[PDB]
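Q: What would this complex look like in 3D?
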Amino acid sequence: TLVKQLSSNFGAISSVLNDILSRLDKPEAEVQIDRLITGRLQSLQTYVTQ
Amino acid sequence: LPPAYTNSFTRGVYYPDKVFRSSVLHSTQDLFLPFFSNVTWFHANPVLPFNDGVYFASTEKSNIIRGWIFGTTLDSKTQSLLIVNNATNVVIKVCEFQFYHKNNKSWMESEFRVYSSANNCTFEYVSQPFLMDLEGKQGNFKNLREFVFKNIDGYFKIYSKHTPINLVRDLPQGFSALEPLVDLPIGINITRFQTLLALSGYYVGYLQPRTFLLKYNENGTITDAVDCALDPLSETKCTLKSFTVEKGIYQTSNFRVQPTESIVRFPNITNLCPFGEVFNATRFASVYAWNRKRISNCVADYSVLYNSASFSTFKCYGVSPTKLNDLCFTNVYADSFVIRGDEVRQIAPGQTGKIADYNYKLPDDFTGCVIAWNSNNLDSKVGGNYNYLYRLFRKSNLKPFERDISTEIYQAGSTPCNGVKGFNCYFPLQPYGFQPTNGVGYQPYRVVVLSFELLHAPATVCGPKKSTNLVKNKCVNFNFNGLTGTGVLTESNKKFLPFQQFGRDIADTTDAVRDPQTLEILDITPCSFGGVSVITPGTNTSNQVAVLY
Amino acid sequence: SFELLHAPATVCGPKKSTNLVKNKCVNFNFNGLTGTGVLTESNKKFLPFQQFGRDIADTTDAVRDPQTLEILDITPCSFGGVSVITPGTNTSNQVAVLY
Amino acid sequence: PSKRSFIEDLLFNKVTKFNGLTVL
Ligand SMILES: CC(=O)N[C@@H]1[C@@H](O)[C@H](O)[C@@H](CO)O[C@H]1O
Ligand SMILES: CC(=O)N[C@@H]1[C@@H](O)[C@H](O)[C@@H](CO)O[C@H]1O
Ligand SMILES: CC(=O)N[C@@H]1[C@@H](O)[C@H](O)[C@@H](CO)O[C@H]1O
Ligand SMILES: CC(=O)N[C@@H]1[C@@H](O)[C@H](O)[C@@H](CO)O[C@H]1O
Ligand SMILES: CC(=O)N[C@@H]1[C@@H](O)[C@H](O)[C@@H](CO)O[C@H]1O
Ligand SMILES: CC(=O)N[C@@H]1[C@@H](O)[C@H](O)[C@@H](CO)O[C@H]1O
Ligand SMILES: CC(=O)N[C@@H]1[C@@H](O)[C@H](O)[C@@H](CO)O[C@H]1O
Ligand SMILES: CC(=O)N[C@@H]1[C@@H](O)[C@H](O)[C@@H](CO)O[C@H]1O
Ligand SMILES: *[C@H]1O[C@H](CO)[C@@H](O)[C@H](O)[C@H]1NC(C)=O
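A: Here is my prediction, written as structure tokens for the whole assembly.
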């Protein structure tokens, strides 16, 4: 489950960081990245709690 | 004069801020002299480089150390910082000085005894002197004055300490932190450092980005510190936030293999995208009946559509206008049409209006770019008018990339019959807003919308990026038709089918790719990330440690 | 360009200062630093260049007064939970309160 | 090779993507 969550794309344009950094500019990528960090961090916190 | 080498060990620490702390261990990332570093000694005016900052120290009096110069190659072309130690004070000036650093005549005039300057007017700061002497030999025998010179952003900072030492022609041990004697808001570029001896010796070191754990005592004085980059033990102390480590094994860091090299591979396409046939078409369709052109099997130079005059707008969605030149695309489309001009906002992916609702709509995700240029000529002729605008649809929110030109009757609900007046017959309207050479919205802005579909399918449109060769059997930074990643490339020996471009594992991550030029299949193995732990016998026993990867 | 540092202010707005109130809960503003608490005389030996302190983790802890250069200790306004001690309301309506 | 009993051997035989993930 923890692995599959990496592909979730939590509201971002892409689940893959490399496809954001190579596509959007600095201030734009940060927005998409924050969405992935929030989702991935929440997923990891859930895993550890369990 | 001739060099020699020694080490610091207990120096290079200073108060990083103007904050009072006490009885704490504080971790800070700043420019510090690494505890174990090679410090260059000079006999006692050589010109040395200035990097991130400079550590300077010398057991000598102000009668020799008359000051320092910091700046770019010293000339009248740029400003330089001149710091001079007088008998009773220190004078600091910034200007386009050629020399000005004499302050003492002797015989050495070939590059001295000259006073050329320009419009100084730059922080002519004066204060009590940097160098204070001792009562002869009634002290510890000589006084090692220590300074740190930093240049960050708009500020030149000077830290210093005196603390007389036992006589030795070397650097002391113990421990001492420097204080911010001077803080000058000077917007000066410094690349070179020179002393003013007007001719003992002095030491020079260089600062580096380091995280230090600083120990503040009860009086807020820094009494000790740990350099995190010195060794596994120091690293352990820095992660545990303690200067004492108990016997046991600790997890401190993460091992990572670096890619070193890079691989860029694309299909061998020599064709160029027919953008001239889109942007310089001269025959632009009305938005009522917009023209959809497909572009494929070509190289797309987009920079020429961006760094170009006459364009009024170039708004990219989902992609940067300066990065799309390095991307691969599939099934690229160019939608060409004419609008009134004040309707440009209505063709944005998420806006409303008659154009957005009836004439031309974009999807919510719309990766692509909306490009338009005034071009009042050709279209807005006097007496002319050739731009159909769809006004009446019956329904709403037509559809993304859909087109409707049926030209039927807009039953207004007045009656279920076939007619014109009271029926709003004819979906478009003939009174095109051309208002030739006047008003606002006189039909400027020819519009081309570039729709960038990004599939994992074989690239057909690639940017003007030069390819290189393969490396294999090494961790590398690779890009296969846009498939950017890091790992080790090896022959897969896998049974790929003729229509497959790449593969994935059970985690649905890229496992292998087909090379676009050789068509061979390469596995991608992630490089080692290990994990580093340190085995400590206890710092109350030994400072020797073992490291486990 | 407006840079905000813990360093001494170089530019201040057109504000009128007040007297310094110490052993009371007050709303303070020191060179733009705002907070609420009690300002007592400190025994912290701030160095000549230091303006603000910090405790083991966070918070100003102590501040240098911009006019007198006196070092003040900042303590939070007292607070705590409030509990109501009662017999059943079917017995009595008298209560006691714990702060 | 493994100093196991017959029953232990049966017990062991019967019972049956490094994205920052590791096993110690
Ligand atoms: C920090 C550093 O590089 N120290 C090395 C030292 O270990 C070595 O022993 C010496 C040559 O003998 O050269 C110094 O530069
Ligand atoms: C002994 C000595 O050098 N005194 C210097 C004087 O030469 C210099 O002109 C002046 C600044 O203008 O500052 C004084 O401290
Ligand atoms: C050689 C020299 O000093 N040239 C200065 C120039 O740098 C300065 O910018 C200008 C006033 O703007 O006045 C000139 O005399
Ligand atoms: C741990 C420590 O150094 N404490 C000293 C104390 O012994 C000394 O008496 C005082 C000045 O009088 O300064 C304190 O910092
Ligand atoms: C693709 C194309 O032909 N673009 C041309 C551009 O090269 C030219 O510089 C400009 C007028 O200055 O008109 C554009 O239509
Ligand atoms: C199918 C294929 O791409 N073959 C490539 C060719 O396109 C390229 O031009 C040549 C080097 O010039 O190397 C061949 O292996
Ligand atoms: C076995 C041993 O070394 N015990 C010492 C103890 O005597 C000392 O008082 C203390 C100070 O922190 O550190 C311990 O490691
Ligand atoms: C709601 C309820 O239980 N009320 C009871 C009441 O019936 C009982 O007679 C009395 C005896 O002291 O205690 C009260 O708490
Ligand atoms: C010094 O650095 C600045 C900022 O990077 C640069 O603009 C300037 O050209 C440099 N000058 C020299 C001599 O390196």
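A: To summarize the key features: The pocket of 2-acetamido-2-deoxy-beta-D-glucopyranose (ligand 3) is lined by residues B 76, 96, 118-119 (CB under 6 Å). The interface with chain B takes residues 6-8, 44-47, 49-54, 56, 61-62 of chain C (CB under 8 Å).
Q: Very helpful, thank you.
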